[PDB]
């Protein structure tokens, strides 16, 4: 499995609506390409993918 190090997060736009009104971008450094599982550990916001 890939290893992700030095990951910091930021949000571009947000609008609390019934749709998925918000985008966030993640920056990281890895060693090899692959597919990772992504999840939000809180309840306030729900992801899409």
């Amino acid at each position: 499995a890939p290893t992700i190090i030095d990951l910091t997060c930021t949000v571009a736009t947000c609008t609390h609506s019934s749709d998925f009104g918000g985008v966030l971008t993640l920056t990281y450094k890895t060693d090899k390409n692959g597919d990772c599982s992504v999840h939000s550990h809180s309840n306030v916001a729900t992801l899409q993918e």
Binding site: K32, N33, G34, D35
Partner: protein
Amino acid sequence: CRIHEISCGAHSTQCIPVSWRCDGENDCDSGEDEENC
């Protein structure tokens, strides 16, 4: 690369997992995997 990885041609050193072959997205440098599929 790994047994489960295919390089995007000999001219490039980048290797991608085989699950990305013909997924409808140009995962290679210039969509080599999506070619001839």
